[PDB]
Each structure stands twice: as C-alpha cells, then as structure tokens.
Amino acid sequence: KVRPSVKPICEKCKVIRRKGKVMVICENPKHKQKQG
Amino acid sequence: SRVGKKLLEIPSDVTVTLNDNNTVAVKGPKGELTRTFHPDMEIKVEDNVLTVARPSDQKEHRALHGTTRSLLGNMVEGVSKGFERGLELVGVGYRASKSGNKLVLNVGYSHPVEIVPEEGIEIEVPSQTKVVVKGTDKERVGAIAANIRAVRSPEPYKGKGIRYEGEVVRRKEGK
Amino acid sequence: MLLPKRVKYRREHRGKMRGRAKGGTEVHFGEFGIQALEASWITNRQIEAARIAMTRYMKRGGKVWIKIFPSKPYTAKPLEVRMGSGKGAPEGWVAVVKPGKVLFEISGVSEEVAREALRLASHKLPIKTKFVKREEIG
Amino acid sequence: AIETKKVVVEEIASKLKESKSTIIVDYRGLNVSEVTELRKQLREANVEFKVYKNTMTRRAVEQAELNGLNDFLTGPNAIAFSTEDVVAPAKVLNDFAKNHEALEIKAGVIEGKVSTVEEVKAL
RNA sequence: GUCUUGGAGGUAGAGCACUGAUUGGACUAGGGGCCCCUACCGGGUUACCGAAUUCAGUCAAACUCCGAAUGCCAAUGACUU
RNA sequence: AUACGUUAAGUGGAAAAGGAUGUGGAGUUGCUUAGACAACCAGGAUGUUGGCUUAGAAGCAGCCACCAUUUAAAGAGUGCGU
RNA sequence: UUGGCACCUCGAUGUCGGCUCAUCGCAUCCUGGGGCUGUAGUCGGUCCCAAGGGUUGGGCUGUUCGCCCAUUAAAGCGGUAC
Ligand SMILES: [Mg+2]
Ligand SMILES: [Mg+2]
Ligand SMILES: [Mg+2]
Ligand SMILES: [Mg+2]
Ligand SMILES: [Mg+2]
Ligand SMILES: [Mg+2]
Ligand SMILES: [Mg+2]
Ligand SMILES: [Mg+2]
Ligand SMILES: [Mg+2]
Ligand SMILES: [Zn+2]
C-alpha cells in the first residue's frame, strides 16, 4: 500500500524510517504502508 | 536505561586476546571467533571486565557504543556454547532427510530439493519431520535457518511448509 | 447557501487584499476557533460544506458561529468567446479574508473534541489555519 | 512523594499495638484468588490482613526505626502485607497453613513477621 | 533646486454619524401555527417574526462624523545654479 | 583568506495542499532513589452479567447512563475475540 | 483536445486520409519479478519494479473516428510541422 500521506490506523501500528523513506508496519498486513 | 554500560564477564575457558585496531578474537570450549570493530570506538578488556569506553557523545557513537557491546556478548556466548534453532516441517506428507553432510527435503514439489551448509554449521534431523540447525555464530545459524525456511514459507489457510520452531501464523479460511 | 437578499450593484471590481484584518480577530462568541493565516477568497459553498461537516462530527451539544459572510459578487464570461465588448454576467458570491480573521467559533463541548472538529473542518478550506481559544483576559 | 511520610508514620500506630504480624508472597496471585482471600478474611478477620499493596521498602525501613529489622530480606522481594493484631497466631498460623499450603497463592518466601525478635517457629 | 511659511483637495488608512449589506442575543403588542377551545371570548404558546426597539459584531468603487504621506499653487527671504 | 554556526540531500543547481520519533536553537510543562519509564513476576471480581433482550449475549444481539461492594486494581469489559 | 493572444512567415512555410521507411517517451497491451486481497484451486481485482523484444487479416464509409466478422500471448497510449 503506497500513498503520500502515511499515518497509523490501528492502535498498535508503528512508524519507522528505512533508507530515508517513511514506513508503517503492523501485525495486520493490511496496515502495512510506505510513503511515496 | 542503557545497554552500552553492562559489564561482560569472562568464563575461565574463554581466553579472549585483545589486539590492536579492534581486531579482537576469542578462544573457548567450542572454537574460535574474530571480528574487527570501529577504530575510534574504544574497547579494553580486563579479566571478566569488558570496558566499552565510549568517546564523546554523538549519534554514531551512541549507536556503536551499544552495538559493539551486544556483538561482543553474542560472540563470547557463542564461543562458550553456541546457538541453534529448530525448524518445524508441518506438511501433509512433507518430510526431510539427511544425506552425507548436506540436507535434502521433499515438499510437494515435483522434485527433491537439497541444501548444503558450509563449515561450522552442522544440520541435524532428529525426527524426519523436524530439523535443528546448530553452530557457533548466532547470525550465521540465523542466516542458514532463514535460507531453509525460504524454501516453502508457511501458508495461511492451512499451516503448511517450513516453520520456525514455535511461532504464531495467521489463519484465514476458504470455502 | 449564504447570499444577500438584494444588492445595489451587480457587477463590481475585484480589488486588492493586502494587509491584516480590520477587526473581528478575537473569538468572543465561544471558546475555540480557527484563525486564518493568508489572504484568499472563500466561496459561498466551501463555507456551507465545512459547516455541515463540522456540525455532523459534533454530537450537536455545542453550537457554531459562522463569522464571515459572502457579500461580494464576482462575474464570469461565457465559454469559448473572444475578449472585450462588455463585462460578463454575475456568477457567485465570495468573502475576502485577510490574515488574522477568525472564521468559526464553537462553544458547548469539551476542548479536545472541538479541536478535532475544527481540524476536520479545516481540510475543506483553501487556506492554512490555526487553532485558537478564547482569550480569558479579554 | 507527599503522603509517603504520612502513611509510613501511620503504619507505626497500627504496628505498635499487636505482638505478631505476617507477610505473604506477592506475585502469582489471582485477584479472583485475592478476592477469595479477602472474603476469607471477612469471615475470619475482616480486613485485619493488610491488603495495602502500594508501598516501597522505605515503608518498612522507616517503620523499622523502632524495631523489626528484618524486612531488608523481604522488602526487595515479593511482599503481600498482613498482620496479627489479635493475640499470638494460635489460630491464624494454621489459617495461613490451610490458605497457602495449596490454595489461592503460594506460600514460598513467607516467613511471617515479628511477634518478638523471632520470625519463624510460631504456633 | 533646496530651506522657511501659507493655502486648496477627500486617495491610503480608518469608522459606522448618513445610505445599503449582515451575524448572535435581549423583546414584541400584531399573532400568524398549536391549541385550551378560537362560534367570537379570555388564556400557556405564539416557535412569535418577535415590528420595531435595544445589546453586542462584521463590510462598501458609485457609504463618510474623520483623514495622512506625497504631489500641486503662491510668497519673501536666504544659499546655489 | 580569518572567526563562529547550519545542512548530508548533490538540497545547493525548479512546484503546492498534505504527511513524518530528520536535525539545531528557544521555551512551556508532568512524573521521578518515598524509584521514574521500560522490561521481566504477578494478578484484572462480588446480590455481578445483576431489571437484558436475539441460542449463553455469561465482554461487544444491544436496552441498562447493563451501576453500587472486596480490597490492591479490576472498567460487574481495553482491545483481541467467541 | 476545444479555446484565448496576434510575436515570425502574404517579392508563396502546399491540406486531410492511405503507401514506403522509421525513431523516441512510458502514465505498460503481452511476456519477466513482487505486495495486499472480500486470494480454497483454475481464473482474477488493485498497486510497485521494468521500455529488451513483440504488438492482425477482412466487411461498410473519402474517411481519421466508429460498428461488425475471424483469429492471437497481445491486438497499448502518445511526440517527431496532428
Ligand atoms: Mg487518506
Ligand atoms: Mg469591531
Ligand atoms: Mg480602504
Ligand atoms: Mg472610500
Ligand atoms: Mg538539485
Ligand atoms: Mg521569398
Ligand atoms: Mg513506470
Ligand atoms: Mg500530417
Ligand atoms: Mg504541436
Ligand atoms: Zn495496525
């Protein structure tokens, strides 16, 4: 899932940075999203 | 708190030899390990005293001052007794088997698949439906186990294929 | 849809929009409000859209206060036609907003819920905003 | 840390009256088991079992300014308060025997508390 | 040309005193609607339209109780050209 | 060249609404050796699922403001749920 | 693309369709590699990387358009004085 506006959805999502990009990982794979 | 300050002890068998350029190695009851570290990062060892001296506080220094300590602990632990990790093989008729030194598996594919390890990592099939890697270096046995598991990742609708030794897998349903 | 009931003139200059707001820069009909930060026009329908969204989010306990009101009309010529020979026909209604104005005011609900409602309303306006609450000292 | 002093001196009045008291291991305690124990109190000794469980070992080392110099081996350790305000544990000893030999919460680290300088071998 | 001094004029800005536009309260006979019962009285409401009026609050190229900086017109002195 | 700061993108050497534990300053402010936040050991109910409706709804068919006591807290359910 | 302006060309810058020959972009039609799925499997839906190669014969109209017949893995969209 890719979009320019990434932000948590559930209560236990998380926000990180990999290779200068913004990412969000969570248990439910449907939440996994990456900015740009 | 902070991990870069916990002091490391040294069991009697562990004979670590500090060397210049942070090229320290180690000797113990299971073999040898060695790693060179960041130059400016300071390390000095006394008997059961691992002095991870950190230079001026920065970002990279605050990172290395922890990472080096963690790796040193891992290394002494490995050379003491090493690590391992089991591998579950669920299947419905899938099963593995040893051969010579290498390892072969028969998942539902139309042909056998084989994996050979390098030195220092012994594979062992205690039961023909269970595999256990074993070796001294933690990251290396991790890599080997990952290679194995990567042959047939588990399946959601029915737990099928390789699986780490105990872990929760999602579970949907078809109809 | 807000619009005057009768106007003197129907076509009218557009005019410049420099300088801060004359007055009405302090919330005094409620507890919280959004304050503009850069000049623009606000279309007749943008206002009602923001208002409906904001009032739906709330549990109707509070009340709202639309401060601004569209009065100036603006024209537009028909499509695919050369230039000149008469000003166009009146089309809609806008309301100029210079920085410092206070567009909306809420009162009757908790602080954070009003903050959320105002943030949700902000995303319908063509400008950048700021959440501001009632000056207690007056 | 306002009322910490307050309660740590307040426990003096409740500790000076009795002779004997008692301690209970803290963790592995079901609050269903805790409420069963509370109702067992209510039928045996209503609330006299000190179910006050919001204290840091300073509580007992500042209650030790008079006597009871033993919590140093219980404070930094599992603690579930209690006391024996009524006469010496001729009854609550066997009460605790039947309530923690195999019941709601284990006995484990329990050594009771001070009647006199002693700690164990009560009856 | 500059310094000094004196004039005419309603822009920028501001303001609601006039003319239009406009928000929220107070308050309303006149009740509109509900009705009690209104066939008709009289009465709660009037959801008043509550008209004003009043209390606060926003606007204007063809609104102004106000109103600059500049520019313009002269003077008699001075210093330069 | 001198002196002191900033940026790690080749920004420098092209753009917005919006998004973000990037990073430097200036603050405001709570908790805290009576021990903080983590992490690990514990637990998280009683006329009590109470007057409940749809099979228990015993956690969330969804009506009670499904309240009050045992304390040490338990919301007679945070979420996962079933 | 439909438009707006009228800056170059009126002592000449010759239109639309088709034929021969092509070449470039990628916002991808096929083939290659993946994430998620309201993905059982075989089919799919959507999004990410990818421009190497490939991308049809007829009927009706001057026709680009368009409809239809029969196939193919596929019968891509655009620029180069449409
Ligand atoms: Mg969105
Ligand atoms: Mg005002
Ligand atoms: Mg003006
Ligand atoms: Mg004027
Ligand atoms: Mg650049
Ligand atoms: Mg010629
Ligand atoms: Mg692409
Ligand atoms: Mg052509
Ligand atoms: Mg062109
Ligand atoms: Zn999530």
Curated annotation (Swiss-Prot), chain A:
Cellular component GO terms held in the UniProt record: cytoplasm; ribonucleoprotein complex; ribosome
Return the InterPro entries for the record: Ribosomal_bL36, Ribosomal_bL36_sp
**Biological processes per GO annotation:** translation
Report the PROSITE patterns cross-referenced here.
Answer: RIBOSOMAL_L36 (PS00828)
Q: Name one GO molecular function term.
A: structural constituent of ribosome
Concerning Pfam families, the annotation shows: Ribosomal_L36
Q: Does the keyword S-adenosyl-L-methionine apply?
A: no
Respond yes or no to whether keyword Hydrolase is given for this record. Answer: no
- Keywords recorded for this protein, A-Z: Ribonucleoprotein, Ribosomal protein
User: What family does this belong to?
Assistant: Belongs to the bacterial ribosomal protein bL36 family.
Q: How does it assemble?
A: Part of the 50S ribosomal subunit.
Q: What is this protein called?
A: Large ribosomal subunit protein bL36
Q: Which organism is it from?
A: Bacillus subtilis (strain 168)
What is the phylogenetic placement of the source species in the record? Bacteria, Bacillati, Bacillota, Bacilli, Bacillales
- Report the gene name: rpmJ
From Swiss-Prot, chain B:
This entry carries the following GO cellular component terms, namely:
cytosolic large ribosomal subunit
| Record Gene3D superfamilies | Ribosomal protein L6, alpha-beta domain (3.90.930.12)
**InterPro entries recorded:** Ribosomal_uL6-like, Ribosomal_uL6-like_a/b-dom_sf, Ribosomal_uL6_a/b-dom, Ribosomal_uL6_bac-type, Ribosomal_uL6_CS
The alphabetized list of GO BP terms reads: cytoplasmic translation
Task: Provide this UniProt record's keywords sorted from A to Z.
Answer: Ribonucleoprotein, Ribosomal protein, RNA-binding, rRNA-binding
What is the superkingdom listed in this entry's lineage?
Answer: Bacteria
Named from the GO MF annotations, one term is: structural constituent of ribosome
- Establish whether keyword Ribosomal protein is in the entry: yes
PROSITE patterns in the cross-refs = RIBOSOMAL_L6_1
Q: Which region is the signal sequence?
A: none
| HAMAP family (alphabetical) | Ribosomal_uL6_B
Give the family, as the similarity comment puts it. Belongs to the universal ribosomal protein uL6 family.
Q: What does this protein do?
A: This protein binds to the 23S rRNA, and is important in its secondary structure. It is located near the subunit interface in the base of the L7/L12 stalk, and near the tRNA binding site of the peptidyltransferase center.
Subunit architecture: Part of the 50S ribosomal subunit.
Q: Which PANTHER family match?
A: 60S/50S RIBOSOMAL PROTEIN L6/L9 (PTHR11655), LARGE RIBOSOMAL SUBUNIT PROTEIN UL6M (PTHR11655:SF14)
In Swiss-Prot or TrEMBL terms, this protein is called Large ribosomal subunit protein uL6
Swiss-Prot record, chain C:
Q: Which domain of life is it from?
A: Bacteria
Q: Which Gene3D superfamilies does this UniProt record tie to the protein?
A: Ribosomal protein L10e/L16 (3.90.1170.10)
Q: Which Pfam families match?
A: Ribosomal_L16
Q: Which GO terms describe its cellular component?
A: cytosolic large ribosomal subunit
Q: What are the GO MF terms of this UniProt record?
A: rRNA binding; structural constituent of ribosome; tRNA binding
Output the GO biological process annotations, alphabetical, semicolon-separated. translation
Q: Which UniProt keywords apply?
A: Ribonucleoprotein, Ribosomal protein, RNA-binding, rRNA-binding, tRNA-binding
Q: Which InterPro entries match?
A: Ribosomal_uL16, Ribosomal_uL16_bact-type, Ribosomal_uL16_CS, Ribosomal_uL16_dom, Ribosomal_uL16_sf
Q: Which PANTHER family match?
A: 50S/60S RIBOSOMAL PROTEIN L16, LARGE RIBOSOMAL SUBUNIT PROTEIN UL16M
Family (UniProt): Belongs to the universal ribosomal protein uL16 family.
Subunit organization:
Part of the 50S ribosomal subunit.
What role does this protein play?
Binds 23S rRNA and is also seen to make contacts with the A and possibly P site tRNAs.
The molecule here is called Large ribosomal subunit protein uL16
- Organism this protein belongs to: Bacillus subtilis (strain 168)
UniProtKB/Swiss-Prot annotation, chain D:
- Cysteine disulfide links: none
Q: What induces it?
A: In response to low temperature and salt stress.
Subunit-structure text: Part of the ribosomal stalk of the 50S ribosomal subunit. The N-terminus interacts with L11 and 23S rRNA to form the base of the stalk. The C-terminus forms an elongated spine to which L12 dimers bind in a sequential fashion forming a pentameric L10(L12)2(L12)2 complex.
Q: Which gene encodes it?
A: rplJ
Which organism is the protein's source?
Bacillus subtilis (strain 168)
Any one GO molecular-function label of the UniProt entry = structural constituent of ribosome
Family per record: Belongs to the universal ribosomal protein uL10 family.
Domain of life where this protein originates: Bacteria
Q: Which UniProt keywords apply?
A: Ribonucleoprotein, Ribosomal protein, RNA-binding, rRNA-binding, Stress response
Which part of the entire protein is covered? 4 to 126 of 166
| Biological role | Forms part of the ribosomal stalk, playing a central role in the interaction of the ribosome with GTP-bound translation factors (such as IF-2, EF-Tu, EF-G and RF3).
**GO BP term, pick one:** translation
Name this protein carries in UniProt: Large ribosomal subunit protein uL10
GO cellular-component term (any): cytosolic large ribosomal subunit
